[PDB]
Amino acid sequence: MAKADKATAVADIAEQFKASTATVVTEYRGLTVANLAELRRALGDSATYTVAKNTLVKRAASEAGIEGLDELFAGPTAIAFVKGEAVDAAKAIKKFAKDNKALVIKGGYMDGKALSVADVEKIADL
């Protein structure tokens, strides 16, 4: 994959992030492609689920004030953007993690702030 492709991916991630009300960063280690397809079925109607390189998002995170999310990029990175509403993907990821048990919620980003596991669980209840 070329460095120009890396720049294009950075630009695409930034463009997707600019149109997203919130985002969720999670861990996906230990999940088959069938599970990911089911998650895309659950999310693809309204939200968006992606997985991207840590440093490519890090450079793509320098656009806005999400630069504080870099500490959430140590380990596997799974991004969930909410194109429709803000928290449907939050319940979708939480139920997927509870059912599969192989998903770890690294954190979330909402209202210009990065929030931890308990905070995101509280937010999803809202």
Complex with other proteins: residue 34 or 74, whichever CB lies closer: 34
Interaction residues for other proteins, span 39-68 (CB under 8 A): 41, 44
Give the count of alpha carbons within 13 A of 37, CB side only.
3
Q: Which one among 7, 11, 19, 37 touches other proteins, defined by CB under 8 A?
A: 37
Q: Edge-to-edge strands of the sheet including 104-110?
A: 48-50, 78-81, 23-27, 104-110, 113-115
Q: In 3D, which of 48, 91, 51, 109 has the Cα closest to residue 75? A: 51
**Residues present in the chain in total:** 126
Per rule CB under 8 A, is residue 84 in the interface with other proteins? no
Residue of 124, 100, 125, 99 whose CA lies nearest to 24: 124
Residue 83 in the binding site for RNA (CB under 7 A): no
> Can you tell me the distance from the alpha carbon of 11 to that of 107, in angstroms, rounded to the nearest whole number?
23
Stretch that binds other proteins, among 9-17, 37-45, 59-67, 90-98 (CB under 8 A): 37-45
Closest distance to RNA from the beta carbon of 30 (Å): 4
What does 96 interact with, of other proteins, RNA, none (CB < 5 to 8 A by kind)? none
Contact set with RNA (CB under 7 A): 1-3, 6-7, 9-10, 28-34, 36-37, 40, 44, 53, 55-56, 59
